Amino acid sequence: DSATHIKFSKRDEDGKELAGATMELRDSSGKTISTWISDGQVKDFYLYPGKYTFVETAAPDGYEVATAITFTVNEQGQVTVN
């Protein structure tokens, strides 16, 4: 199939984009397919059908590491979260 446009936002509790968070995107086997630090913008991804997980390795000071987020992209481009 084709790649589905995923938009990822790391934010504070006030809903503002938060920079300084070291992030990983992993595939269904746990392999890190993307690595980055948040910079205050929405981060774009394009994923083929499969199961993935956003994982935070380090939070900026004054903040707690969020629970990892597992989601699936199906053949019709629909995205289902936990």
């Binding site: 589905t4 446009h5 995923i6 938009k7 990822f8 936002s9 790391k10 934010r11 504070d12 509790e13 938060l18 968070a21 956003f54 935070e56 939070a59 900026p60 004054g62 903040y63 707690e64 590491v65 969020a66 987020i69 989601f71 629909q78 995205v79 979260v81």
Partner: peptide
């Protein structure tokens, strides 16, 4: 499709 992850504030 959007995915939103929130960094919670550390305890006060």
């Amino acid at each position: 499709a959007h995915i939103v992850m929130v960094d919670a504030y550390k305890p006060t």
